[PDB]
Write an enzyme that holds these catalytic residues in place. Structure first.
Site, PDB file in Angstrom:
ATOM      1  N   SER A 160      85.124  -0.001 -34.258  1.00 51.89           N
ATOM      2  CA  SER A 160      85.475  -1.042 -33.223  1.00 51.89           C
ATOM      3  C   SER A 160      84.284  -2.032 -33.113  1.00 51.89           C
ATOM      4  CB  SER A 160      85.822  -0.341 -31.969  1.00 51.89           C
ATOM      5  OG  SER A 160      86.493  -1.421 -31.111  1.00 51.89           O
ATOM      6  N   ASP A 252      97.325  -2.123 -34.099  1.00 50.63           N
ATOM      7  CA  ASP A 252      95.871  -2.519 -33.429  1.00 50.63           C
ATOM      8  C   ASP A 252      95.959  -4.001 -33.177  1.00 50.63           C
ATOM      9  OD1 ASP A 252      93.328  -2.877 -32.738  1.00 50.63           O
ATOM     10  OD2 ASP A 252      92.487  -1.774 -34.206  1.00 50.63           O
ATOM     11  N   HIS A 282      94.368   1.590 -32.626  1.00 52.24           N
ATOM     12  CA  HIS A 282      92.968   1.487 -32.598  1.00 52.24           C
ATOM     13  C   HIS A 282      92.538   2.919 -31.996  1.00 52.24           C
ATOM     14  CE1 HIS A 282      89.680  -1.376 -32.338  1.00 52.24           C
ATOM     15  NE2 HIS A 282      89.314  -0.602 -31.241  1.00 52.24           N
TER      16      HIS A 282
END
Lengths: 313, 312
Positions: A160, A252, A282
């Site tokens: 991320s 995501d 995610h």
């Protein structure tokens, strides 16, 4: 209806019943503690290792806290060293939130791994996190005595915001090399291109863990300039990128940001393994207990890393 | 000056010293023999394998000649590699790519069936494609004549053969064979039309595959620019098989393979993209005179083993 795995769907249904507060409504301490709790709930337990050691290195603003992980009792010869940057929007996350995942990567790679506790926003806005991640990587690459490793190269990896840091650090070191090269970079569901008007943002911005409200919260705290490649490394140089594995998740909202980076590498003639994990969200790397199929996803990334390291260009 | 490896550059300089006809100036027989001679000169020797066997299968216009390669004396269920040779759909055959086929079979430790598909100009587009599809469907049926129990198909091919690889995968995705395509490996393939690409402008002369050769192939095969069987960039990608796309950095059709890898990413489909740096089109068959290309091929082999061992 986008394809979703049964175990992923069950986890989302459980999280929808929790109906926790938005990050913007919490104190920073509460938000940071809530994130640790979520990973402790959803992820597999940490592995026992002979080497899990806290240490520090000099950084631009003071010492940067690090944690060294190694499944081996001793490792004195030349070795690649994994440098890990945790996710959390550059606002939350620390050495403990991603602790279990770090023991897993270190054990499955049979390599030493150093996790970086970089300066977080909003207290330290952009570019503070990047500069800490770069400083730690350059320090690790210098084979310092306090680490005890002889580094032959650096493997960068991060989820991320940590995937953002992965690519930025690789670009900074491509431009101005450290003592050894980045031999592999693994940005995992990374923010590389601005996600604001992407199709995946419109499709998955609610109901799939990572929300538009959370993205806006991180955005305001970090304050990265839209035209700065250190904020949005899709704008950085790609024709000398290190060997790369880009990992995205099909559900995501920032999926298209990682897709854009893989395409930019191809446009620059640079090797890239593109893995999009189908039917998961995610943060899937930290859901391996309650979404058991995500352990198999992680193991595919591991196998890609071993393939790339054993077969350099 | 584009980056070129020293052994690659020396080979190109040697080939520039040859003073003979271009492919279009020869008879078809002469062009086909000259291609065999080029690969015999440039490539490593074929490996000794216990099984190298000629056979045939039914096709849409008659029998399709095949060649089975297996490093094992005796072979339960197994993936089967189906190989389509390059040559612009005009030249190439079972002998031009023989050495490479023995190498892929040996290094994968898998059986491999090469396909002698119908060639242009005698058989225009789409004859080659329909032969490749028919052969792959037949192999996938585990016929007694082959002696294999197939659990899946691995498609692979170079240049025009990489075009055939992707097209066959799309035809089987739309109407499956008896077992699935479990991996496809298009190597410096033609996927999108190359005509106005930047790589075509940059590498059209001096790098083995030339604009004259591409024009010669195009005027013989005559692929329909609107047909995904001619240009599979136009086909469906959201159900594509696991893919390894291989390009070469000095290749005039490099951008065609890059475009396919980008299309797979746009469709959310896993793809290993390998661009071999400092080498030309056809590098898979230059392993003796450009020795660094053996290491390039071994990287592709390792990528294939990784994908097969770690399916989604």
């Amino acid at each position: 209806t986008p394809y979703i795995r049964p175990d992923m769907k069950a986890f989302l249904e459980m999280m929808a019943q929790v109906n926790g507060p938005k990050l913007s409504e919490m104190s920073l301490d509460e938000a940071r503690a809530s994130y640790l709790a979520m990973h402790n709930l959803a992820d597999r337990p940490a592995r026992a290792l002979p080497v899990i050691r806290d240490l520090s290195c000099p950084g631009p603003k003071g010492e940067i806290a690090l944690r060294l992980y190694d499944p081996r009792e001793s490792r004195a010869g030349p070795t690649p060293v994994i440098t890990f940057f945790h996710g959390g929007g550059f606002v939350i996350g620390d050495l403990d939130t991603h602790h279990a995942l770090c023991t897993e990567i270190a054990a499955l790679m049979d390599l030493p791994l150093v996790a970086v506790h970089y300066a977080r926003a909003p207290e330290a806005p952009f570019p503070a996190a990047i500069l800490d991640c770069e400083a730690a990587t350059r320090w690790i690459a210098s084979s310092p005595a306090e680490l005890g490793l002889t580094a032959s190269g650096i493997i960068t990896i991060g989820d991320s915001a940590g995937g953002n840091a992965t690519v930025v650090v690789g670009q900074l070191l491509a431009a101005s090399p450290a003592a050894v090269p980045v031999v592999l970079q693994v940005p995992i569901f990374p923010l590389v291109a601005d996600a604001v008007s992407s199709e995946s943002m419109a499709a998955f911005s609610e109901g799939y863990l990572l929300t538009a409200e959370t993205m806006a919260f991180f955005d305001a705290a970090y304050g990265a300039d839209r035209s700065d490649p250190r904020g949005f490394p899709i704008l950085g140089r790609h024709d000398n990128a290190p060997p790369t594995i880009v990992v995205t998740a099909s559900l995501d909202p920032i999926r298209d940001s990682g897709r854009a980076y893989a395409k930019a590498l191809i446009d620059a003639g640079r090797d890239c393994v593109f893995l999009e994990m189908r039917g998961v969200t995610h943060s899937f790397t930290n859901l391996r207990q309650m979404v058991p199929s995500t352990q198999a996803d992680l193991e595919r990334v591991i196998a890609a890393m071993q393939f790339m390291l054993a077969n350099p260009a």
